[PDB]
Amino acid sequence: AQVSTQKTGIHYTNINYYKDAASNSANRQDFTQDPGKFTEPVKDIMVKTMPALN
Amino acid sequence: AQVSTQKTGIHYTNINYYKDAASNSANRQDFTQDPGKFTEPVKDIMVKTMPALN
Amino acid sequence: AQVSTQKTGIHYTNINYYKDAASNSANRQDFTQDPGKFTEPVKDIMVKTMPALN
Amino acid sequence: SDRVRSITLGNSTITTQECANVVVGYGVWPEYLKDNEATAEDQPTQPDVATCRFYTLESVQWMKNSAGWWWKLPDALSQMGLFGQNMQYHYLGRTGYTIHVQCNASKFHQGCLLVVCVPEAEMGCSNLNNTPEFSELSGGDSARMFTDTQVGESNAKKVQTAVWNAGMGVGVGNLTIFPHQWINLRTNNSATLVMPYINSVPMDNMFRHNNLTLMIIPFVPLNYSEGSSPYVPITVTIAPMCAEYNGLRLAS
Amino acid sequence: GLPVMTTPGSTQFLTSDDFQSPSAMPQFDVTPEMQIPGRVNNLMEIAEVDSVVPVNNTEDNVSSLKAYQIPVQSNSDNGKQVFGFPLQPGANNVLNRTLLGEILNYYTHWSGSIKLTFMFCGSAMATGKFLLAYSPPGAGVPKNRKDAMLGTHVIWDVGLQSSCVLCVPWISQTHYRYVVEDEYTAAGYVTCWYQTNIVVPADVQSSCDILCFVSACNDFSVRMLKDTPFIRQDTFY
Amino acid sequence: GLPVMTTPGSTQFLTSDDFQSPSAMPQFDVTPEMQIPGRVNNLMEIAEVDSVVPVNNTED
Amino acid sequence: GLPVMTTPGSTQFLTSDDFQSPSAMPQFDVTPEMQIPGRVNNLMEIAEVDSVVPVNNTED
Amino acid sequence: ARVADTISSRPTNSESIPALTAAETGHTSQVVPSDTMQTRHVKNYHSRSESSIENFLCRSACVYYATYTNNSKKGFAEWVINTRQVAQLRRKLELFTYLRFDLELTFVITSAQQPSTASSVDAPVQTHQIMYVPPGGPVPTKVKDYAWQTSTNPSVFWTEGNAPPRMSIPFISIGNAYSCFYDGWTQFSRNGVYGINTLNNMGTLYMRHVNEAGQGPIKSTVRIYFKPKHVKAWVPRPPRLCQYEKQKNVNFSPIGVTTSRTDIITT
Amino acid sequence: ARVADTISSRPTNSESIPALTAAETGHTSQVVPSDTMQTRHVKNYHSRSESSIENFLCRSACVYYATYTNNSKKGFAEWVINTRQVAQLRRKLELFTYLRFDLELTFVITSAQQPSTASSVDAPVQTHQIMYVPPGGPVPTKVKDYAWQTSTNPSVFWTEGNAPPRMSIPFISIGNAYSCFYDGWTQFSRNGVYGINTLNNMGTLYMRHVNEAGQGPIKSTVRIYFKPKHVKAWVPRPPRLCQYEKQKNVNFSPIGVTTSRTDIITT
Amino acid sequence: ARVADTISSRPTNSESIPALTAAETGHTSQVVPSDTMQTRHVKNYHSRSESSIENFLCRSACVYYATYTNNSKKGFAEWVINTRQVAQLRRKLELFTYLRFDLELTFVITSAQQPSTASSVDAPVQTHQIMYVPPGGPVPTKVKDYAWQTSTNPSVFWTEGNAPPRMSIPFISIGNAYSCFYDGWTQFSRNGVYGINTLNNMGTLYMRHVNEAGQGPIKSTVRIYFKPKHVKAWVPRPPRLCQYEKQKNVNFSPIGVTTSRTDIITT
Ligand SMILES: CCCCCCCCCCCCCCCC(=O)O
Ligand SMILES: CCCCCCCCCCCCCCCC(=O)O
Ligand SMILES: CCCCCCCCCCCCCCCC(=O)O
């Protein structure tokens, strides 16, 4: 039995009943961010206060 | 599992099953009173046995 | 969870699910006797082997 | 002696020799906005001596056949000094208030007034289909008055100003659930209420929303004998408290 | 396949149930809470606030502010009655519509004491003394000041302090009382008489007025929530 | 979704059952108990009290 | 035979529910995962990228 | 709750008199049969578990049944709640003077087809609503009424073909116990209503169809069942001899104490 | 939540005046009845548990009911979500100025047979769909429409003859609390709409039959029930005296404060 | 997943230039509004929980619906499994290039009565069978066929009037992810089929009545719902502007980028 944290703005219990991992519920609580691979895909890093081209 | 006190004039058990806190049951046992903010909203405190105006 | 004794001529388990004490099951196992308040409601006690009036 | 007060705010002072206590809102004193409740993210303006001072509105005459008066509170101070100039250049704002109603008469007069402060006092119309237009709902530091009769349905956009329904469809005797005081000419001379900021949002626009209403209703009418002074005025004095603004733009 | 067995009370909709239900919008971020002044936790904090009582109905003062004023004169005799009404806080039309009498019309049982505050809104040179009495049931209504002084009374002397409180105690054979009108659970009568006269100087008006207030003590409680009979509907708005 | 299976005896009303049911008036304060004289706990205390017997029926 | 009682909301299809269901192909071996470049975890990473704005609509 | 067992005894010749007593004292004799004759030792294993007040009264009993028709102007049913219209539960509860219990309520709803005149009559599943109005509230006057909004009155909904509806009721009273008998009036002048009708104020129960009359009338019938739980009882009472005649009072016609036989020595 | 108990008292002759006060301060007197008369010690066991905001508001109340017909061109129902078309829930929620709660939604669906003309009418079990569209999305224009694909709008399906459908809704708002009263306009020029209609934007709810019209028309009716959970409340308010007339505003006709009696001394 | 909070700032006069940048590098500027103006400290409690890929895609969406008649020669339905016949799920899945998820499948089955000619038509409860054939197996050619023996093909049975049937499907693929777009052919000679039809091989789904045609025809309709679970996504993509025209390819008719206005300074 897994005890998790129950998103608010208190806990709950979860037991798995079936033998296959495709039978479980949705994840719904995997909050992970990596915006840098789309917004800054450059080779040399760029400091904000410095000019872009020297 | 939460064990609470079961209002009389004896305990009971409660488990949460869902991931959101809006899915729980009602509170129904939060007894709190503060009548002074409506009945005595004055600046200087007034003793009962003393006169109101001196 | 309450474990009781299960009347015979072996145990069982009982959990309460609701918040009010009027929602429980019946008692059914409160065996108490006091027949003396109806059969001998006299002031001075009466021994069986002695006569009633002296 | 509890009968004397002295209130000092900016360059103005009120002195009273015959008074009841001071009613403080819902037990809360006015204060500035905290960092946990803020949503607008630029720096606010706090003038704090040029706006937080006593402004006096006009005076009304208490007659014998007098029914009541009301004021919408962030609207009478819309042309008063530097308070009404910050409202025109900014988009947001929050304010607490201090109200001082004052009326004096001799020991040979009688009468009683109820001075309440109603948050979100939405009013009704005399024609059952429309809503009242802006010129009847409020005035620029001038009282709108109730009447002892009922406004007919032949008018289109006018407020229903029957006193015993208080303009809102409720009982007038139950208005004492709001923070209030009484003025009894037998014993009292003034009334002082301190109100904090009450809204469902941390800041609001002060030109599309009136969030307070001050009503003065005579329960016992004014009476005197022959020879006494027939002219009795009522004067209201309001001071903003802990005011701040956000969102500079053009003058509107 | 765990073996189960379904009991009576299945697939029913009881409107006062206490269950969990699945959310229709999963993983929602609500707006954070703010400190708004004036939070109500119990309905008894509303009922413990004074409210003006319309003792002066009299068939033409109900569409006026004159229903709240109690007339007081200077008499040529002694021992006259000012007002009087039975103590029924949810069925009598005097205390029906007040702030205490509207919370009671949502419930069925009530229990506790009741405060009654009287204010003299006259001139500052007028005097007077009054008698504020309460009579438990069993007999009728008192018709004299001699009969009304035998109950629970207070003598009010009008001076600089302009208010007085008559605290109606809880005298009952049971623990609770019915809100609707019921002769088994009656509560009695509240009257008011002249103790002395209203003596006034020259060039002062003789006719004064008295206001009345009502609230509840700190032992008041209610029970058995129901609907109110004070609203109608015919079609949807 | 726990897998369950319903047995015979479901959706029946046996008049001497022993179950729990949801309350229709939640959070009710009952009147406190009082000491009334003469509490009956068993029906055999009633049957152990003397009673006059009509041995003389005889049709009139 | 455990005694149970069914509540409202039974035998309904709410399209945003979160339950378990039995698998139709038991003991299946999925293809192992590969490192593909450019994984999206949140939709806000897409919205934080510049995009050219058509300010010059003007009917033609 | 085992009963007492038998004690062995011997022949006696003594001064002690267990059989002689005096019934004039209002005191029932406490003699066992091992005082009047020679007995053997017998271990009793019998129990008094089935005669308790918790076991005697905690069974379901029918109290009322009412009917209401679909295709009818003002077709709905009402009932003022009491326990004095049936003869079997009234005799069980009136063995005591004061009672105090919780309640369990169960409804049994049926339906029947009325002789309509149209062809191809086929109706969907019926839904019923049962509303409880505490004393003082607003009552329905017809079927399409605003009073069925049930904002604070408790009600229940049920679709035909399932388990019967059930709910619990706590000890709702103004006094400290329910009273089966009241020897007094409701007025202080001792006029008018005399008896148990001065204490009965429990509310009214309303019943209706939620569906519309499609193409054929339908007549339904509800049945109400009471079941006391957590019972306390005080001051027992003789059982009723005569037959009940009314509901509000205890009026009767006199009857003999038993049935007769032909002689005093007839076995 | 026990109430305060009574304290015994003695005869007094002193300078302290509990009964004399001044109501001009806006301050309710805090006198107990053990200050004006001689009392005894009484232990109170009463509780204020049934008058809490969590107990006063957490009951199911009907807010709307709408109908839609099977054999009809464009036969479906819509409703813009508000709490101002019924008279009993509107008076309960308008005792406060600001409210904040979660929600519980329940639907009650019935059906009725319409007077068709064919012989041997026999229809299978009916299935209904209830769709929720947040403000800004696409709306259905007919029954066979692409907008019922419910790719991201939440919907529910239900077959007739089961338990009613139920779901939960969190505190969906833009501000920090719901507002029952709004004293202002929506335009900065102070024209047009004045009142609570400037804050109401909650969406629309759609209802339809999923089956096809086989051989006979069928008219259904849904009923919607609201139940607030996890309630907070601020700034209480006097109750409404006059009767409600419209939905968008607070317009009324004036009425007296109470009903009348014949004298001031009439008991 | 809390968002970043605001930092207080001061008036500056310096060499650092946050506002000046170069967008020619393909690099989005990382300026916050506390660099261009004076701000206050604000603690943000907002979360990005509702915009995750697990929350954006895990909802049920209709993909197909088909009909089949009882009283018909060869009355049964088939469907080749794809996600490109609906317009709302196709636009949501084509924001990415590669996807990988599990599946949840739900069916909604209704029925309707057809205009028969006999009298006293009364049919029992209907039972349906839904069969899944992986590519390469034997397919049914009629209703009474040997291919419905379902010895190793998974199938499901369902009786009308209950909860809808539901089952789970794992990530069934030959590659490492599903592909929404394929820029290539299926032949090495670069002829014939070009596009996403070269990768679609998922099977066929069959539907039939298990009962017999008793005395009246019955027309049923099934509806299929998809719900992706355990989602991973790669390489985002611009959303579709034009309307979809076919299923196999991405052919369109050209359209403007937005709608027009009357001037460049029109507000
Ligand atoms: C749908 C909810 C229905 C609620 C029904 C509540 C019925 C109240 C029960 C009252 C018990 C009556 C006991 C006998 C009274 C007496 O003997 O004086
Ligand atoms: C099938 C899902 C249905 C979803 C229904 C969601 C309805 C939203 C509820 C809004 C609450 C309205 C509260 C009152 C608003 C106000 O007073 O201003
Ligand atoms: C009764 C059992 C039914 C079994 C149904 C299995 C259906 C297989 C699902 C295939 C997922 C298709 C995903 C999209 C394919 C693609 O985009 O190329």
| Ligand 2 binding pocket includes I177 (Cβ within 6 Å) | no
Residues 18 through 47 of chain A touching chain B, CB cutoff 8 Å: 28-29
Question: Number of structural domains, chain H?
Answer: 1
Neighbour count for residue J53 (Cβ, 10 Å): 22
Closest CA to E106 of E226, E19, E232: E226
Domain of residue B27, residue span: 1-54
J263 vs G51, J256, J257, J266, CA distance in Å? 22, 17, 17, 5
Range J109-118 burial, b when 16+ CB lie within 10 A, else e: bbbbbeebee
Distance of CA J240 to the CA centre of its chain: 15
What whole-number distance in Å separates Cα of residue H114 and Cα of residue H71? 9
All residues at 6 or more sequence positions from H33 whose CB lies less than 8 Å from its CB, including other chains: H6, H39
C-alpha distance from F7 to closest chain C C-alpha (Å): 20
Neighbour count for residue I212 (Cβ, 10 Å): 18
Which residue reads 């409740």 in tokens? Answer: D37
All residues at 6 or more sequence positions from D11 whose CB lies less than 8 Å from its CB, including other chains: D49, D53
What whole-number distance in Å separates Cα of residue E20 and Cα of residue G7? 9
β pairing state of I218-236 and I155-159: unpaired
CB contact under 8 A, G16 and E2: no
CB contact under 8 A, E51 and D176: yes
Count of residues making up chain H: 267
CB contact under 8 A, J30 and A48: yes
Q: Does F7 touch chain G (CB under 8 A)?
A: yes
Closest CA to G46 of E208, A38, E89: A38
What whole-number distance in Å separates Cα of residue I266 and Cα of residue E191? 10
- E151: exposed, middle or buried (C-beta count within 10 Å: 0-12, 13-18, 19+)? middle
Provide the 3-class DSSP secondary structure of residue D69.
Answer: strand
- D42: exposed, middle or buried (C-beta count within 10 Å: 0-12, 13-18, 19+)? middle
* DSSP H/E element including E163: strand E163-168
* DSSP H/E element including G46: helix G44-47
What whole-number distance in Å separates Cα of residue J39 and Cα of residue D211? 28
Written as one string, the DSSP assignment of D82-115 is THHHHHHH-SEEEEEEEEEEE----TT-EEEEEE
The residue whose C-alpha atom lies closest to atom 2 belonging to ligand 2 is I132
Q: Chain G interface residues facing chain A, Cβ-Cβ under 8 Å?
A: 18-23, 26-28, 38-39, 41-42, 44-46, 48-49
CB contact under 8 A, E14 and H156: yes
Q: Domain segments of chain D: what residues? A: 5-248
- Local structure of residue H50 (DSSP, 8 states): G
The residue whose C-alpha atom lies closest to atom 12 belonging to ligand 3 is J82
β pairing state of E208-216 and E51-52: antiparallel
Neighbour count for residue E129 (Cβ, 10 Å): 13
Q: What's chain I look like in SS3? A: CECCCECCCCCCCCCCCCCEECHHHCCCCCCCCCCCCCCCCECCCCECHHHEHHHHCCCCEEEEEEEEECCCCCCCEEEECCCCCCCHHHHHHCCEEEEEEEEEEEEEEEEEECCCCCCCCCCCCCEEEEEEECCCCCCCCCCCCHHHHCCCCCEEEEECCCCCCEEEECCCCCCCCEECCCCEECCCCCCCCECHHHCCCCCEEEEEECCCCCCCCEEEEEEEEEEEEEEEEEEECCCECCCCCCCCCCCCCCCCCCCCCCCCCCC
CA of H136 relative to ligand 1 center, distance in Å? 16
- E202: exposed, middle or buried (C-beta count within 10 Å: 0-12, 13-18, 19+)? exposed
- Local structure of residue E68 (DSSP, 8 states): G
Question: Number of structural domains, chain A?
Answer: 1
- E36: exposed, middle or buried (C-beta count within 10 Å: 0-12, 13-18, 19+)? buried
Compute and round to an integer the Cα radius of gyration of chain H: 27
Which residue reads 């032909």 in tokens? Answer: H262
What whole-number distance in Å separates Cα of residue H130 and Cα of residue H207? 5
List beta partners, residue I170. none
The phi, psi pair for I32, rounded to 5°, reads -105, 160
Which residue reads 């502010």 in tokens? Answer: E65
Q: Do D194 and D25 contact (CB within 8 A), yes or no? A: yes
Q: Do I60 and H150 contact (CB within 8 A), yes or no? A: yes
What whole-number distance in Å separates Cα of residue E14 and Cα of residue I258? 36
Q: Do I121 and I217 contact (CB within 8 A), yes or no? A: no
β pairing state of H127-133 and H204-209: antiparallel
Q: Do I123 and I216 contact (CB within 8 A), yes or no? A: yes
To the nearest 10°, the Cα dihedral for E94, E99, E102, E107?
-110
Q: Do F47 and B26 contact (CB within 8 A), yes or no? A: no
To the nearest 10°, the Cα dihedral for H157, H159, H161, H164?
0
All residues at 6 or more sequence positions from C54 whose CB lies less than 8 Å from its CB, including other chains: none
The sign of the dihedral angle between the CA atoms of J132, J137, J139, J143 is: negative
- Local structure of residue D34 (DSSP, 8 states): P
| Per-residue tokens: H111 | 């339906």
Which of H124, H210, H214 has its CB closest to that of I160? H124
| Ligand 2 binding pocket includes I83 (Cβ within 6 Å) | yes
* DSSP H/E element including J234: strand J218-236
D186 vs B23, E120, E207, CA distance in Å? 59, 9, 14
Helix ranges (H only) for H81-125 are 88-93
CATH class of domain segment(s) D5-248? mainly beta
Residue J91 CA neighbour count, 13 Å, CB half = 11
List beta partners, residue E208. E72
Q: Do I241 and D170 contact (CB within 8 A), yes or no? A: yes
* DSSP H/E element including F46: helix F44-47
CA of D28 relative to ligand 3 center, distance in Å? 62
The residue whose C-alpha atom lies closest to atom 3 belonging to ligand 1 is H132
**Closest chain A residue to B21 measured between Cα atoms?**
A8
| Per-residue tokens: F35 | 């000491």
To the nearest 10°, the Cα dihedral for H148, H154, H157, H161?
-140
The helices-and-strands tally (H runs, E runs) of chain C is: 1, 2
Closest CA to I47 of J149, D229, B29: B29
What whole-number distance in Å separates Cα of residue J63 and Cα of residue J93? 13
The sign of the dihedral angle between the CA atoms of H91, H96, H97, H98 is: negative
C-alpha distance from J4 to closest chain E C-alpha (Å): 16
To the nearest 10°, the Cα dihedral for E63, E68, E72, E78?
110
Resolution of the structure in the document, Å: 3.2
The phi, psi pair for E197, rounded to 5°, reads -90, 175
Q: Does I125 touch chain J (CB under 8 A)?
A: yes
Residues 32 through 51 of chain B touching chain E, CB cutoff 8 Å: 32-35, 37-39, 51
Q: Do C29 and C2 contact (CB within 8 A), yes or no? A: no
Range I123-132 burial, b when 16+ CB lie within 10 A, else e: bbbbbbbbbb
List beta partners, residue H155. H131
Q: Do J26 and J188 contact (CB within 8 A), yes or no? A: no
C-alpha distance from I233 to closest chain D C-alpha (Å): 11
Closest CA to D39 of D250, D248, D208, D246: D246
Residue I125 CA neighbour count, 13 Å, CB half = 19
β pairing state of B12-14 and E177-178: unpaired
Residues of F in contact with A17 (CB under 8 A): 1-3
The helices-and-strands tally (H runs, E runs) of chain B is: 1, 2
Domain of residue H78, residue span: 1-267
Distance of CA H226 to the CA centre of its chain: 6
What whole-number distance in Å separates Cα of residue B20 and Cα of residue B26? 14
All residues at 6 or more sequence positions from I67 whose CB lies less than 8 Å from its CB, including other chains: I77, I219, I220, I221
- G40: exposed, middle or buried (C-beta count within 10 Å: 0-12, 13-18, 19+)? buried
Neighbour count for residue D111 (Cβ, 10 Å): 25
Name the closest ligand to CA I231.
Answer: 2
Q: Do E104 and E230 contact (CB within 8 A), yes or no? A: no
Q: Do H235 and H98 contact (CB within 8 A), yes or no? A: yes
Distance of CA D119 to the CA centre of its chain: 10
The helix, strand and coil proportions of chain G, stated in percent and rounded to the nearest 5, come to 5, 15, 80
CB contact under 8 A, G40 and J51: no
Chains I and E: 3 or more CB pairs within 8 Å of each other: yes
The identity of residue E10, as a single letter, is S
Chains D and H: 3 or more CB pairs within 8 Å of each other: no
Q: Domain segments of chain E: what residues? A: 1-237
To the nearest 10°, the Cα dihedral for J259, J260, J265, J267?
-50
Which residue reads 């007069």 in tokens? Answer: D109
Closest CA to D41 of J20, J32, E32, J47: J32
| Per-residue tokens: I215 | 């051989």
Residues of B in contact with E218 (CB under 8 A): 35
What whole-number distance in Å separates Cα of residue D168 and Cα of residue E215? 23
Residues of J in contact with G40 (CB under 8 A): 53, 96, 233-234, 236
Q: Do I187 and I238 contact (CB within 8 A), yes or no? A: no
Neighbour count for residue E115 (Cβ, 10 Å): 23
What whole-number distance in Å separates Cα of residue J25 and Cα of residue F59? 124
Q: Do E104 and E223 contact (CB within 8 A), yes or no? A: no
By most ligand atoms within 8 Å of CB, the mutation choice from H99, H133, H168, H169 for ligand 1 is H169
What whole-number distance in Å separates Cα of residue J32 and Cα of residue J47? 18
All residues at 6 or more sequence positions from I207 whose CB lies less than 8 Å from its CB, including other chains: I66, I68, I76, I77, I78, I128, I129, I130, I131, I222
What whole-number distance in Å separates Cα of residue H81 and Cα of residue H103? 13
What whole-number distance in Å separates Cα of residue I195 and Cα of residue I249? 6
